[PDB]
Amino acid sequence: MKTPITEAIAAADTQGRFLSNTELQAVDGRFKRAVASMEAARALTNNAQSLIDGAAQAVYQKFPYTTTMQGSQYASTPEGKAKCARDIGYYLRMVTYCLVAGGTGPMDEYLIAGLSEINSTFDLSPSWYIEALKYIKANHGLTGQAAVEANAYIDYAINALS
């Protein structure tokens, strides 16, 4: 899994080397940035339920057709609404994991590999999920370098959906 610490080892091992100063500087940078990353992960975790509930309603107001058309891909039935709320929580939960590890590794392995196949096969639109992520960004209530950390990972996911 890609983190600032596993990347450092990978470069030494690839070339057959012991770790050097070049690599130790990287890992200290990681350790210093962690105070802000944790502040953000805790806040997002504590307010998770209202963020998910508000994000789903934002999607339904932007694309009203998803609450009326017939089809198992839509949120026109109680089961479909249940499934949409679950996906949005998957996305939030992967952001907190990235912050705790100090990089993109978790979202790469658990979510972004296979994403475009799954969306095409079950007839799910990227634009729906982008709208939800924009709502979380605008309302997480964070300030300063902790808001910076949260936004860098949310924007990472938006780019993969574009």
């Binding site: 899994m1 080892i9 770790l19 200290d28 350790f31 962690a34």
Partner: protein
């Protein structure tokens, strides 16, 4: 390859959960002791050639049959191969100290090594003696009280000990 953080993440995903407060606090604890972890990797790394050499000279004095004609470290090609093996074990151990998890050591070094020595005719118990000697040298260098800001590093020296022993158990 995991580190101590990625470890916790991959466990929580298995049951589909956000982290508890206990977990945030334990990981905050890790980050606060990070300076000492960095001192230990630099000290052990900066004296790598001396740790290997002195452990080699020690083993051959105690077990002089290894270098008699017919021995597993006789001729310069087998001696060179023996010295190399020690350098490698020491490297993957320093990696695992940085990461705070043994997965890089187990997965890319120790896995399959017992079977390799048995097929070559190399005595595994002898290798484990060499590992144990590098250990005692490394802990002394890392925990040297001079030229450094005082404090307590005992929990870290206990974790370090563990990695050397694990390598030792796997070959013997």
């Amino acid at each position: 390859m995991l580190d101590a953080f990625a470890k916790v993440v991959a466990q929580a995903d298995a049951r589909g959960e956000f982290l508890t407060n206990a977990q945030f606090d334990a990981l905050s604890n890790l980050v606060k002791e990070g300076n000492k972890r960095l001192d230990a990797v630099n000290r052990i790394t900066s004296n790598a050639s001396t740790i290997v050499a002195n452990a080699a000279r020690a083993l051959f004095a105690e077990q002089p049959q290894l270098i008699q004609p017919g021995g597993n470290a006789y001729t310069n090609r087998r001696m060179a191969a023996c010295l190399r093996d020690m350098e490698i074990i020491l490297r993957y151990v320093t990696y695992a100290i940085l990461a705070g998890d043994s997965s890089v050591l187990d997965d890319r070094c120790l896995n399959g090594l017992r079977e390799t020595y048995q097929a070559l005719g190399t005595p595994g118990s002898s290798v484990a003696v060499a590992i144990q000697k590098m250990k005692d040298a490394a802990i002394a260098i890392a925990n040297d009280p001079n030229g450094i800001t005082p404090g307590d590093c005992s929990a870290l020296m206990s974790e370090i000990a563990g990695y050397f022993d694990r390598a030792a158990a796997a070959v013997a």
